[PDB]
Amino acid sequence: QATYTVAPGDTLYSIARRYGTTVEELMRLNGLESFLLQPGQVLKLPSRERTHVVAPGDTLFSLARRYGTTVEALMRLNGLSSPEIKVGQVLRLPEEGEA
């Protein structure tokens, strides 16, 4: 779960612009009803897909266990047909709930 601390000068639209989301989505995920933002308030950010650059010694199993997902979900997300991975390969990572 990604969050963000509201800084002086921030607004729901100014933050939404940065992280490529909408004002409504920010309010919908935080349960807000007002456009007011207190400096220091913690806002929940819309989930963005994590990423991993395959390093020496990595396996799909180790990466899956590391990022709280499964080998199966990892391969599906990246359209893989075999478990082999190469050093330097960029993998899209499922969410920690196998999502």
Residue numbers in the entry: 16 to 114
Provide the publication's sentences verbatim.
We have also successfully solved the crystal structure of P60_2LysM without any ligand. By comparing the LysM domains in this structure with the LysM domains in the full-length P60_tth and the P60_2LysM–chitohexaose structures, we observe that binding of the carbohydrate triggers only minor structural rearrangements in the binding pocket. The linker seems to allow some flexibility between LysM domains, but we cannot claim for certain that the movement is triggered by carbohydrate binding because such movements may arise owing to crystal packing.
Glycosidases, such as muraminidases and glucosaminidases, hydrolyze glycosidic bonds between carbo­hydrate units, while peptidases, such as amidases, l,d-endopeptidases, d,l-endopeptidases, l,d-carboxypeptidases and d,d-carboxypeptidases, hydrolyze amide bonds of the peptide stem at specific positions. d,l-Endopeptidases belonging to the papain-like peptidase superfamily possess an NlpC/P60 domain which is responsible for their catalytic activity. This domain is commonly associated with PGN-binding domains such as the SH3b domain, choline-binding domain or lysin motif (LysM).
